[PDB]
Amino acid sequence: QFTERALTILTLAQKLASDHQHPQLQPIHILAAFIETPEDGSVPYLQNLIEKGRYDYDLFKKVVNRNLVRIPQQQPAPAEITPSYALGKVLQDAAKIQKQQKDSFIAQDHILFALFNDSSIQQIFKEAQVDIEAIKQQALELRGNTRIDSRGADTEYLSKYAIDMTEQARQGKLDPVIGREEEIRSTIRVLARRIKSNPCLIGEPGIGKTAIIEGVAQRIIDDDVPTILQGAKLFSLDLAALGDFEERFKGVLKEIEESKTLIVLFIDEIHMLMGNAANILKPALSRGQLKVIGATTNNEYRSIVEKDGAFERRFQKIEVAEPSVRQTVAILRGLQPKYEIHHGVRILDSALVTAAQLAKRYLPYRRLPDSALDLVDISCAGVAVARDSKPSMIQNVVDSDTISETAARLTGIPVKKLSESENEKLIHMERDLSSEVVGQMDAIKAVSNAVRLSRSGLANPRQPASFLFLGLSGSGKTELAKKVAGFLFNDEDMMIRVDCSELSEKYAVSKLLGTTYDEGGFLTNQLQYKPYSVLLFDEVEKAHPDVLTVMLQMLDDGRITSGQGKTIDCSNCIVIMTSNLGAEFINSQQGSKIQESTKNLVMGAVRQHFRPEFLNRISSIVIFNKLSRKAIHKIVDIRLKEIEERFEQNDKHYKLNLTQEAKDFLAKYGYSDDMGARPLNRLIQNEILNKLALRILKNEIKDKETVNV
Amino acid sequence: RRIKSNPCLIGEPGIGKTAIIEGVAQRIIDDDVPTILQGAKLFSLDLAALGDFEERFKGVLKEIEESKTLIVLFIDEIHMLMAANILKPALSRGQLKVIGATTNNEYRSIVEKDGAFERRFQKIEVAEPSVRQTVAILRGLQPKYEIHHGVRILDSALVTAAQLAKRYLPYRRLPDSALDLVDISCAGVAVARDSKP
Amino acid sequence: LKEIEERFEQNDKHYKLNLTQEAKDFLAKYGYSDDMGARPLNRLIQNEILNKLALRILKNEIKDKETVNV
Ligand SMILES: Nc1ncnc2c1ncn2[C@@H]1O[C@H](COP(=O)(O)OP(=O)(O)OP(=O)(O)O)[C@@H](O)[C@H]1O
Numbered sequence: 001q002f003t004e005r006a007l008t009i010l011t012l013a014q015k016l017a018s019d020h021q022h023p024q025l026q027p028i029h030i031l032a033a034f035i036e037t038p039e040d041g042s043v044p045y046l047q048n049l050i051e052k053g054r055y056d057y058d059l060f061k062k063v064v065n066r067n068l069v070r071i072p073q074q075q076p077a078p079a080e081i082t083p084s085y086a087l088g089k090v091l092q093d094a095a096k097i098q099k100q101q102k103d104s105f106i107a108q109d110h111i112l113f114a115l116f117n118d119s120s121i122q123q124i125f126k127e128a129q130v131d132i133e134a135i136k137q138q139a140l141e142l143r144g145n146t147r148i149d150s151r152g153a154d155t156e157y158l159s160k161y162a163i164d165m166t167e168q169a170r171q172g173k174l175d176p177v178i179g180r181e182e183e184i185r186s187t188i189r190v191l192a193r194r195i196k197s198n199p200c201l202i203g204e205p206g207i208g209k210t211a212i213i214e215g216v217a218q219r220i221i222d223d224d225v226p227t228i229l230q231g232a233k234l235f236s237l238d239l240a241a242l243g244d245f246e247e248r249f250k251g252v253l254k255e256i257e258e259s260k261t262l263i264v265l266f267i268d269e270i271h272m273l274m275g276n277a278a279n280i281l282k283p284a285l286s287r288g289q290l291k292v293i294g295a296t297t298n299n300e301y302r303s304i305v306e307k308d309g310a311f312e313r314r315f316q317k318i319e320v321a322e323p324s325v326r327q328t329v330a331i332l333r334g335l336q337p338k339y340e341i342h343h344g345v346r347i348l349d350s351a352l353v354t355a356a357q358l359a360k361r362y363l364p365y366r367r368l369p370d371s372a373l374d375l376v377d378i379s380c381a382g383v384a385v386a387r388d389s390k391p392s393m394i395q396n397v398v399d400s401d402t403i404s405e406t407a408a409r410l411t412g413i414p415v416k417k418l419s420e421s422e423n424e425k426l427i428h429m430e431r432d433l434s435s436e437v438v439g440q441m442d443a444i445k446a447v448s449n450a451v452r453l454s455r456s457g458l459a460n461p462r463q464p465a466s467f468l469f470l471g472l473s474g475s476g477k478t479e480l481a482k483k484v485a486g487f488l489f490n491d492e493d494m495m496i497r498v499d500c501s502e503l504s505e506k507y508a509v510s511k512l513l514g515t516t517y518d519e520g521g522f523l524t525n526q527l528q529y530k531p532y533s534v535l536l537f538d539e540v541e542k543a544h545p546d547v548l549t550v551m552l553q554m555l556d557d558g559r560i561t562s563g564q565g566k567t568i569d570c571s572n573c574i575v576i577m578t579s580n581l582g583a584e585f586i587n588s589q590q591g592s593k594i595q596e597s598t599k600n601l602v603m604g605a606v607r608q609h610f611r612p613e614f615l616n617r618i619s620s621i622v623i624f625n626k627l628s629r630k631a632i633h634k635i636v637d638i639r640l641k642e643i644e645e646r647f648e649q650n651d652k653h654y655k656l657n658l659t660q661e662a663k664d665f666l667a668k669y670g671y672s673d674d675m676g677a678r679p680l681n682r683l684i685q686n687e688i689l690n691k692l693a694l695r696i697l698k699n700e701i702k703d704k705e706t707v708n709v
Numbered sequence: 710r711r712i713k714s715n716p717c718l719i720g721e722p723g724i725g726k727t728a729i730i731e732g733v734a735q736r737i738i739d740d741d742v743p744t745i746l747q748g749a750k751l752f753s754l755d756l757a758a759l760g761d762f763e764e765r766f767k768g769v770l771k772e773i774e775e776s777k778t779l780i781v782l783f784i785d786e787i788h789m790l791m792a793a794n795i796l797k798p799a800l801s802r803g804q805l806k807v808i809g810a811t812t813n814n815e816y817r818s819i820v821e822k823d824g825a826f827e828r829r830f831q832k833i834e835v836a837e838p839s840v841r842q843t844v845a846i847l848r849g850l851q852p853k854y855e856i857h858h859g860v861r862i863l864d865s866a867l868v869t870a871a872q873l874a875k876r877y878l879p880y881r882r883l884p885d886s887a888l889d890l891v892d893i894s895c896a897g898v899a900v901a902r903d904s905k906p
Numbered sequence: 907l908k909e910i911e912e913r914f915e916q917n918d919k920h921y922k923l924n925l926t927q928e929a930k931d932f933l934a935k936y937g938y939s940d941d942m943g944a945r946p947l948n949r950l951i952q953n954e955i956l957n958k959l960a961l962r963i964l965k966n967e968i969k970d971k972e973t974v975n976v
C-alpha cells in the first residue's frame with residue numbers, strides 16, 4: 001500500500017485534480033498537490049530532494065497551477081476518475097526508487113519519485129524532475145532510511161516536540177542568566193562526563209533551571225561550549241504529543257540517537273514511572289549513549305532516581321539554590337528595561353532593590369528571581385494600571401507603594417513594611433514591648449539582645465533563636481512572643497504551638513516522618529509553610545527524650561530535617577520553651593528573693609531535666625518573676641487598648657471612661673497570684689464588656705458615649 | 710563445574726560483577742573458555758519488559774534451546790519472582806548454563822525459598838577490589854578516559870586518586886567512584902580546558 | 907576569638923577583633939567557673955561582649971572592619 005502521508009497527498013492530488021475538476025490525472029498535476037504553500041510544511045518546495053538535489057522550486061513555484069488551470073476543464077465524476085496510466089504508473093512507478101534507495105512501501109519521495117519523467121516543465125528549457133539525480137542524492141539528505149510504514153508523521157519528528165533555544169539563542173530571544181555561570185560550568189563539566197553527562201537540578205523551580213539551560217545553550221551558540229559538544233546543540237521536549245503517544249516519543253529518540261550528538265534534549269521535572277508507560281528511553285539512556293540532562297525537586301528525585309539507581313548512575317544531580325538576594329538585582333537590572341518597556345514605564349532602583357529586599361522576607365514561597373519580579377510586574381501593573389487607566393507622572397517605580405503597597409497588596413501594615421531599617425527594631429523594641437509588657441527587663445534585654453544578636457549575624461548564619469522562658473501561667477510569655485513576632489514579624493502567627501506535654505514517645509513521628517499513615521506533616525508543614533516563624537514548646541520537662549533529642553538540631557543551626565527528609569531553616573525563626581519547675585521557686589519573688597539565686601535554684605531543676613549541652617544550645621533562658629500590681633494594673637488600660645482597638649474605632653466610636661476604683665477593683669480582682677491576670681482578660685470580658693454590651697441596644701450608650709461601672 | 714555451572718555473584722552492586730562478565734565474555738573470544746564451556750558464548754539479558762509481555766522472555770528459552778546451550782546467559786541484579794517464577798523450566802529441563810548474580814539482598818528473598826534452584830548456583834560474593842585493581846584498571850583506563858575526554862593525566866595522581874578515594878569513600882565501589890572522580894577530574898578540567906580558560 | 911572571627915571577620919562581616927586581658931580578666935575571672943570551667947564564659951560572651959557590638963553594629967558610631975577592645 002502507498003504511504004498514508006504519500007496517500008494523504010495522493011488523494012489530495014486526486015482532490016487536487018478534483019477542485020478544478022480536471023479531465024485526467026496527468027504528470028504535472030500533483031506538482032500543485034505536493035504543495036499546500038511554499039512552507040516546508042510542503043517539503044516539495046524547498047525541503048524537497050530536488051531543490052536540494054537539482055531543481056529549486058522558489059520561482060519554480062510559479063508554473064504548477066499554471067498548468068492545472070490550463071488543463072481543459074471537466075465535470076465532477078470524470079475528475080479523479082482515471083489513473084491515466086501515463087500518470088497511473090506513478091502508482092507503481094513510485095516503487096522504483098524503493099529499490100535503489102532501499103525502501104518498501106511507496107512514500108512521499110516515491111510518489112514524487114515516479115513523477116520524475118513528465119511531471120515537470122519538459123521543454124528545451126526544462127524545469128523538471130531529474131530522474132535519479134535529486135532523490136537518491138537527497139533521499140539520503142532527507143532521511144537516509146526513509147521507509148517505515150504508510151503510517152507515521154512527515155517523511156522530522158524533531159521540530160514537533162523539540163524546541164531549541166539555540167534557535168532562539170542565535171535569534172537572541174531568551175534572557176541572559178546571571179550568576180549561574182559556574183553552575184552552568186559545573187553542569188557543563190558533568191555534561192562532559194562520559195559516565196554521567198546528566199546534570200540534575202534540585203530546588204524550588206522558577207529558579208532559572210531552563211534559563212540555566214539557556215546559559216548552557218548560550219555557551220553553545222557563543223561557542224563558550226568546549227570542544228566535545230560544540231557540535232552538539234540544544235533541544236527540550238514538548239509534552240504536546242497528544243492514537244498512542246510514548247511510541248511517538250520513542251520516535252525522536254531513535255532519530256536523535258541517529259542525529260548523532262549534534263543536539264541535546266532537556267527535560268525538567270517530569271521523569272516518570274507512569275501509572276497505568278514504564279521505562280522508555282530509561283533503557284535508551286541506560287543504552288550508555290545519548291547525552292541527556294536531568295533536573296527535579298527532592299522527593300521526586302528520591303522517588304525515581306533511587307528506585308533505579310542507574311538513574312543515579314545515569315544522573316548526577318547539581319542542586320541550585322534560590323540565589324543570594326543581590327543576584328536578581330542584576331536580572332532585575334536585566335529585566336528592569338524589559339517589563340517597564342513592556343509596561344511603558346520606568347524603574348527606580350530604590351523599589352527595584354527593595355523588591356527582593358522585602359519579598360525575600362515577607363513573601364513566603366517563590367524564588368529570588370521569581371518572587372521579586374512577581375511583585376515587580378504587579379507593582380508595574382498597578383502603577384501602569386493607574387497610568388493606563390488614569391489616576392503616569394509615576395513611570396519609575398519608587399519604593400514605598402510600588403513595594404510596600406504592592407507588598408501590603410499582599411499583606412498590610414505597610415508603614416512597618418515601609419519604615420524599618422531592620423536595625424531600628426532592635427533599638428526601640430524594648431520600650432516598644434515595654435509598652436506591650438511590663439517588667440521582665442531581662443526578657444526585655446536578653447530576648448531583644450538575643451534577637452538583636454539573632455540578626456546582625458554575630459554567630460552562625462545557620463543558628464536558631466533559642467528561648468526557654470519561665471514564670472507563671474498568665475505571665476505574658478505567650479504574649480511576649482506574640483508581641484515579639486508581632487513586633488518582629490509584624491504578626492503573632494509566626495508563633496507555632498506544641499505543648500511538650502502533648503506526646504510522650506513517638507511525636508518524632510507526629511512532627512514528621514518518611515510517611516507510610518501518611519502525615520502531610522506538622523512542624524515544617526507549618527514552618528516550611530511559614531519560613532518566618534516562632535516555635536512555642538511547653539512544659540519541656542514533659543518534652544520527652546523523643547522530642548528533646550531532635551531539639552538538638554532544632555537547637556542547632558536553625559535548620560531542621562523533615563520526615564520526608566528535607567532540612568528546613570529555623571534560623572529565620574524563634575523557638576520558645578517553658579516549664580513549671582521553679583514556679584514553686586517563684587516563691588522566691590514572693591519574698592522578692594534574689595532571682596539569680598533562685599535562678600540557680602531553678603537552674604538545677606531544668607539542668608536536672610536536661611543536658612547542659614542541650615542547654616548550652618540555648619541563647620538564654622529566663623524566668624518571669626511576678627511584677628508590681630502597678631505593672632499588673634499598668635497592663636489594664638493597655639489591656640483595654642486592645643479592647644477599644646476595633647471597638648470605638650471600626651464600630652462603636654465609643655468614648656471611654658474608667659473609674660480607678662473599678663480599675664483598682666480590677667487591679668484588685670484582675671490579677672491572680674497563680675494565674676497572673678489571665679483572668680483579667682476574661683474578667684474584663686464580662687462586667688466591662690457586658691454592661692457595655694448590654695447598654696448598647698439599651699441606647700443610653702449611643703455613639704461617642706462614655707460610661708464605666 | 711558440571712555440577713553447579715550457574716554461579717551466584719553476590720555483593721553490593723557497582724563493584725564490577727558484570728565487569729567480571731566482561732573479561733568472561735572476553736575469555737570466550739580469548740578462547741581460554743573451557744572445553745565444557747567452549748562452544749557456548751555470552752548472552753546477557755538486560756530485562757526490558759515493554760497480553761503478557763514477559764512470555765517473550767520465556768519464548769526465548771527455546772531460542773537458546775534452539776542454539777542448544779551454544780551460549781551462556783547472565784542476569785545481574787534482577788533475580789526475583791518473575792511470569793510467576795523466573796527462568797528455570799529451561800534450566801529445570803536440566804539444560805541452560807547461565808551466569809547468575811545478585812546482591813545478597815535478592816539472594817535473601819526468593820532463592821532463600823527453594824535453595825534447590827540454587828542447586829545450580831554456587832554463590833560467589835565479590836569484595837570491593839583492592840588498590841591495584843583500581844590502579845590497574847585505572848592504569849588501563851587512565852589513557853582510556855583521558856583519551857575518552859581527549860586529555861592527559863598524571864599516573865602520579867592516578868594511584869594517588871584511589872588512596873584518599875579508598876580512604877574517604879563513604880559509599881561506593883572505589884574504581885567507579887575513582888573512575889567517577891577520575892572522569893570528574895578528567896572532564897572537570899577538560900571542560901575547563903574545552904571552553905577557553 | 908576564633909569563633910568570633912569565623913563569622914564577622916570571616917564568613918560574614920570582615921570585622922577585625924581586639925581584646926585586652928583587662929577585659930579578658932573582666933571576663934575569664936568571672937568567665938571561669940570551677941566545676942563547669944569557662945563553658946559558662948562561652949554563653950556569657952554571647953551578649954555583653956557580643957551584643958555590645960550587636961548594639962554598636964547599628965549604633966555604628968564606629969563601623970565594620972574596625973576593632974575596639976574594652
Ligand atoms: N538566571 C536566570 N535567567 C533568566 N531568567 C531567570 C533566571 N532565573 C530565573 N529566571 C526566571 O524565573 C523562571 C525560571 O526559569 P527556568 O525554567 O529557567 O527555571 P525554572 O525553575 O525551570 O522555572 P520553571 O519552574 O517554570 O521551570 C523563569 O520565569 C525565568 O524567566
Ligand SMILES: Nc1ncnc2c1ncn2[C@@H]1O[C@H](COP(=O)(O)OP(=O)(O)OP(=O)(O)O)[C@@H](O)[C@H]1O
Binds near residue numbers: 439476
Ligand atoms: N507583663 C505583662 N505585660 C502584659 N501582659 C501581660 C503581662 N503578664 C501577663 N500578661 C497577660 O497575661 C495573659 C496570659 O499570659 P501568658 O503568656 O502567661 O499565657 P500563656 O503563655 O498563653 O499560658 P496561659 O495563657 O494559660 O497563662 C495575656 O493576656 C498577657 O497579655
Ligand SMILES: Nc1ncnc2c1ncn2[C@@H]1O[C@H](COP(=O)(O)OP(=O)(O)OP(=O)(O)O)[C@@H](O)[C@H]1O
Binds near residue numbers: 721722724725726785
Ligand atoms: N576491572 C575492570 N576493567 C575494566 N572496566 C571495568 C572493570 N571493573 C569495572 N569496569 C567498568 O565498570 C563499568 C560497569 O561495571 P559493572 O556493571 O561491571 O559493575 P557491577 O558491580 O557489575 O554493577 P552491577 O552489579 O549492577 O552489574 C563499565 O564501564 C566497565 O568498563
